[PDB]
Design a protein around this ligand. Structure first.
Ligand code: SF4
Ligand SMILES: [Zn+2]
Ligand SMILES: [Zn+2]
Ligand SMILES: [Zn+2]
Ligand SMILES: [Zn+2]
Lengths: 356, 32, 752
């Protein structure tokens, strides 16, 4: 019954996963991550303290974010002494943001938070962003009160007019203004305001924000963006880089001005042209053609083979059949592959193998 | 106008419905 | 939605409905069809007013009888909420039936709340507003203007403009709230107060406060126009007895009598002046008095009597004037010596309580005033003043109080008591004698209402126990039941705290209000909760004096400085306008995330109609049981009357009275089922009152929460708030707490 208890719970966990449709998502993102560093974040509800754990998870989030969003940009803001302090400008270099976050980890948080100051700073940082990018703001709020110099409601109206999207992660309880901010700014959706219940749930919440947010039907900004694919060149002698002005062995050559760049993806320092490899675009295709989920086969019918199609793991005979089939190709898979096929891979081997 | 919205019971109104757009991607291209 | 009852189709203004609302509607329909009175206790977290309007409006529009609806609330603010809900419901009906049906609905209030005159609406007292309006609307100015246009007397364009149009065309068909009514009348220069009062006989549903139904002074004029078979609803009637008692109560001070002699002397001087120049008016009035006419036959419908009838219409004598006070001079002398007897009775040195009969006998002894002439004091005065051309009545205002006392003491003899105290304030350098006329029986004022109207519905959010109200008020109910909300997940956490973090017992007994340990223990509770409460916090104190003393102690200790760091502090004040601004600031602070804490009085103005749904209220801190001041002569006499007559124990009533107020405040936090909040009762004496709380609140109070400490309370509150912040599972409430149209049909099938 204990194993069956997992299965019935698994079926309930699979109930939400059943409804999957290819919703349009904005791959080009421009995220502004806001952190709360106030007196309320000195509590011990999160070990060792909220400030330490949040910073530690922020480092992990940065790594994951740039891993699945190679052509996006991020900016870091913190709240301190009732003011918003900029610590990282919008940039495509994951190392610069990580270094900035590490430095912040030392100073002790103090003072009160100010949403209006943080929102206003985020509003200005996203002003010089193309219209094809999705402007998003992620806030890690821990305080139950906000001290602002002006009217927060006016800022909320401005954010909606600027088509910015706000996600807020709370620590203790729901704040009415935060709920309004996450609702009025998301076309009335109320699922963008999440309050954690433990340390483990926080990791999932951070991981969820990595994926691009679906776009609204009435919000259309379709356009073509000019991109370039530079060719890597190997040089015998070091040469000055056009981005940092330092001697480096080799760098990718822009096909529009031949200027060299240390690393990709980055905006060309000469023609202001985005340099991206073909692999970077390939990293986001799984969000446009997501692999359809697998449905377990009832034990009443007869199974095809005793071994897994993909990993050759012998199916445990033992009640409920531990087999999941693909509707497109109708090939049974073990429980292990389905997790690996939907988290690591994004293509069904059975469908590819079938000839047409 | 503003007072009317406050006095109404939101919980009894129709649940918010998502209005996200769907995309179907056709796949075809010329050979190298 | 639009579902069906046994034979009555009802249109709900929402696509969804709670199980309680449908059960509430079914019981109401049964009572209306069967006849009689009933007492229904519906939870505050479920739509009550909307359910009442939906069913009752459909009932009047479907059955051939087309019985009218009378809605009685406790405060003017509640009338606005009811009208707004009515407008929303009627809009839904107009959109589903395809046309605007013949329907009229208006709210009622005093001139102060509906006066548009640029010079008369700027007054801080309602009595002055009434006097000015009567001067411009009595008709003396109009009659004087007709005779001689040169007269400087002015008119009211709003009142004058109404004569052009007929009564049926004052307002277009539909429902007009106060906010909408003023805007429509301002654009046409009309008086909303006169428009409403002249259309009561034409309104399908009429909404007014309890004072307009139970107080004989103002109820008689309004009651004379309403129908006899109309539906009567008593919403939030858990404190109706206080209104009933205050209607037939009066207080006389030394200053009131001192101001009465000056008015009486002025009245005599005015009579002498009129006697010299214009004596025909007195003779004309005297001739009618000899005939046997009264104020009703003499005064026109346009004008109002100077002294409002202080007794019920059924207790007024229909015989002619006795003859002693038939003449102006004789009546003035009668009035003058009556004042002296009151003055000489204010020199007592110890509290004396006597029945009206004993007072009358002593009055008949020292002087020679009989009972019958005393009963006509108010009626006679209104006639004399009206005929005296008293355009300015500032001097005679005090005489109204004496006339009211004379007509009250000489009319009722059972259930009334007369209290004379040598110390109005026990802590006073100089004694301040006071004469109080108190009404002990609470059913005297409401007896005519329960007899004139066949069907009456009494509903409130915290009316419990239901058995006592029929005992206190002499009436019988066909059914009396209370509903329990079927909430899928716990939405409110009621807790009782008996001791502080140091395990020291905490109580709000007045004798120990100045205790460093209790004051600190309560202060620690306030600070600790304010740290976890997200946006709003309402704090209710047993009495305003208790709040003043304890708040001042906190200021000296330094508790407030710590509270200021987290939330803004707003405090209720005796001034009504200042308190209203505080609520506006408190609501603004909670909406913008600044966070605010409101300190109020459980028996104050806030608790009698102000709501804190969602953000404006997330935690209720009841600082002590709101016990009444036991060492009160008025209260002690009231308790004795109930014990001897209704066999109600003194302790039981006192506990019931205190709990009915504590529960009242608790129900002002939940709107719908998506609303949540933590209710903490901070007193060691709440531990044994669980059985006395409302059923829907008691069911939510666990056995482990009956006696908690401050530290344990915070831990539970933090856990509860965290739990309520998660996305609710829709399947957990698809058909167990909220019903769609399909689910409602299923319930009607299984039940049948
Ligand atoms: S008639 Fe109406 S507007 Fe004119 S003074 Fe009286 S209440 Fe005010
Ligand atoms: Zn470089
Ligand atoms: Zn270039
Ligand atoms: Zn496998
Ligand atoms: Zn497949």
């Amino acid at each position: 019954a204990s194993l069956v208890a997992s299965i019935v719970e698994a079926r309930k966990k699979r109930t939400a996963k059943k409804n999957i449709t290819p919703y349009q998502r904005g791959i080009i993102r421009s995220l502004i991550l806001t952190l709360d560093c106030s007196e309320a974040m000195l509590e011990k509800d999160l070990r060792p303290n909220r400030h330490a754990m949040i910073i530690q998870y922020a480092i992990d989030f940065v790594h994951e974010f740039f891993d699945q969003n190679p052509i996006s940009q991020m900016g870091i803001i913190i709240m301190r002494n009732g003011l918003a302090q900029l610590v990282s400008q919008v940039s495509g270099n994951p190392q610069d943001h990580i270094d900035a976050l590490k430095s912040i980890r030392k100073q002790e948080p103090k003072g009160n938070p100010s949403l209006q100051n943080a929102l206003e700073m985020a509003r200005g940082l996203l002003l010089p962003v193309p219209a094809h990018c999705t402007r998003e703001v992620l806030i890690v709020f821990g305080s139950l009160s906000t001290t602002d110099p002006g009217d927060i409601h006016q800022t909320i109206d401005s954010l909606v007019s600027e088509k910015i999207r706000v996600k807020v992660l709370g620590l203790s309880a729901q704040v009415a203004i935060c709920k309004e901010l996450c609702k009025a700014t998301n076309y009335g959706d109320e699922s963008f305001y999440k309050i954690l219940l433990d340390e483990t749930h926080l990791k999932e919440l951070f991981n969820e924000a990595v994926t691009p947010l679906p776009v609204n039907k009435i919000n259309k900004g379709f356009t073509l963006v000019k991109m370039g694919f530079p060719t890597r060149i190997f040089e015998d002698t070091p040469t000055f880089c056009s981005c940092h002005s330092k001697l480096v062995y080799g760098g990718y050559f822009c096909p529009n001005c031949h200027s060299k760049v240390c690393s990709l993806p980055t905006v060309c320092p000469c023609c202001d042209l985005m340099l991206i490899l073909s692999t970077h675009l390939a990293r986001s295709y799984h969000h446009l053609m997501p692999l359809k989920t697998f449905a377990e086969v009832p034990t009443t019918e007869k199974f095809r083979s005793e071994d897994c199609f993909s990993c050759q793991s012998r199916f445990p005979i033992l009640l409920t059949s531990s087999r999941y089939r693909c509707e497109d190709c109708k090939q049974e898979f073990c429980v292990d592959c389905d997790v690996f096929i939907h988290e690591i891979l994004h293509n069904c081997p059975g469908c590819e193998s079938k000839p047409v | 106008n503003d007072e009317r919205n406050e006095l109404k019971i939101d919980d009894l109104n129709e649940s918010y419905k998502t209005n996200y757009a769907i995309i179907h991607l056709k796949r075809n291209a010329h050979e190298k | 939605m639009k579902f069906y009852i046994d034979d009555l189709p009802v249109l709900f203004p929402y696509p969804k409905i709670y199980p309680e609302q449908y059960n509430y509607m079914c019981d109401i329909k049964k009572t209306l069809d069967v006849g009689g009175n009933s007492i229904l206790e519906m939870p505050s977290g479920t739509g009550k007013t909307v359910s009442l309007l939906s069913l009752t409006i459909a009932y009047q529009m479907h059955y051939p009888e087309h019985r009218k609806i009378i809605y009685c609330s406790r405060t003017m603010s509640e009338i606005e909420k009811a009208l707004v809900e009515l407008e929303n419901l009627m809009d839904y009906r107009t959109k589903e039936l395809g046309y605007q049906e013949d329907f009229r609905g208006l709210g009622l209030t005093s001139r102060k709340n509906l006066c548009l005159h640029p010079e008369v609406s700027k007054e801080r007292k309602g009595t002055v507003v009434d006097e000015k309006c009567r001067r411009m609307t009595n008709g003396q100015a109009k009659r004087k203007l007709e005779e001689d246009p040169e007269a400087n007397v002015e008119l009211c364009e709003y009142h004058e403009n109404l004569y052009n149009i007929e009564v049926e065309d004052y307002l277009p068909k539909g429902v007009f709230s106060f906010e909408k009514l003023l805007k429509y009348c301002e654009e046409k220069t009309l008086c909303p107060y006169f428009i409403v009062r002249r259309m009561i006989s034409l309104c399908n549903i009429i909404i007014y406060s309890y004072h307009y139904l139970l107080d004989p002074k103002i109820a008689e004029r309004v009651s004379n126009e309403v129908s006899k078979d109309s539906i009567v609803i008593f919403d939030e009637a858990h404190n109706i007895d206080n209104v009933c008692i205050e209607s037939l109560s009066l207080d006389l001070t030394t200053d009131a009598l001192r101001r009465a002699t000056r008015g009486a002397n002025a009245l005599d001087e005015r009579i002498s002046e009129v006697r010299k120049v214009d004596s025909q008016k007195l003779q004309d009035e005297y001739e009618k008095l000899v005939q046997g006419l009264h104020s009703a036959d003499i005064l026109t419908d346009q004008e109002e009597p100077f002294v409002e009838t202080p007794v019920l219409p059924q207790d007024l004598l229909t015989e002619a004037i006795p003859g002693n006070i038939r003449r102006a001079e004789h009546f003035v002398s009668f009035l003058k010596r009556l004042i002296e007897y009151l003055k000489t009775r204010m020199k007592v040195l110890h509290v004396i309580s006597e029945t009206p009969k004993s007072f009358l006998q002593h009055l008949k002894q020292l002087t020679f005033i009989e009972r019958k002439p005393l009963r006509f004091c108010s009626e006679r005065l209104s006639l004399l003043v009206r005929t005296l051309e008293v355009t300015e009545v500032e001097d005679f205002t005090a005489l109204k109080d004496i006339a009211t006392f004379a007509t009250l003491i000489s009319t009722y003899e059972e259930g009334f008591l007369l209290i004379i105290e040598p110390y109005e304030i026990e802590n006073a350098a100089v004694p301040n004698p006071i004469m109080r006329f108190t009404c002990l029986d609470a059913s005297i004022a409401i007896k005519p209402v329960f007899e004139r109207f066949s069907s009456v519905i009494i509903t409130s959010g915290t009316i419990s126990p239901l058995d006592m109200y029929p005992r206190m008020l002499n009436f019988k109910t066909v059914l009396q039941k209370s509903y329990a909300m079927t909430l899928a997940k716990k939405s409110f956490l009621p807790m009782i705290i008996t001791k502080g973090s140091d395990q020291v017992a905490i109580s709000s007994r007045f004798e120990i209000r100045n205790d460093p340990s209790i004051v600190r223990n309560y202060g620690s509770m306030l600070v600790e909760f304010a740290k976890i409460t997200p946006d709003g916090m309402v704090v209710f104190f047993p009495s305003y004096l208790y709040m003043e003393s304890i708040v001042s102690m906190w200021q000296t200790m330094g508790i407030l400085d710590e509270v200021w760091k987290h939330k803004l502090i707003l405090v209720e004040t005796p001034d009504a306008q200042e308190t209203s601004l505080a609520l506006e600031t408190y609501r603004k602070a909670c909406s913008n995330g600044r966070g605010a804490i409101l300190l109020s009085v459980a028996r104050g103005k806030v608790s009698e109609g102000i709501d804190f749904d969602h953000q404006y209220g997330r935690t209720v801190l009841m600082i002590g049981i709101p016990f009444q001041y036991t060492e009160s002569r008025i209260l002690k006499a009231r308790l004795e009357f109930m014990r001897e007559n209704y066999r109600i124990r003194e302790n039981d009533f006192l506990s019931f009275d205190a709990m009915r107020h504590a529960a009242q405040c608790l129900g002002r936090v939940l709107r719908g089922k998506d609303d949540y909040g933590v209710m903490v009762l901070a007193d060691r004496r709440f531990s044994r009152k669980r059985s006395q709380l409302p059923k829907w609140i008691a069911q939510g109070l666990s056995d482990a929460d009956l006696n908690l400490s401050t530290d344990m309370a915070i831990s539970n509150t933090k856990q509860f708030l965290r739990t309520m912040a998660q996305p609710t599972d829709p399947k957990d409430q698809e058909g167990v707490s909220v019903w769609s149209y399909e689910d409602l049909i299923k319930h009607q099938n299984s039940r049948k």
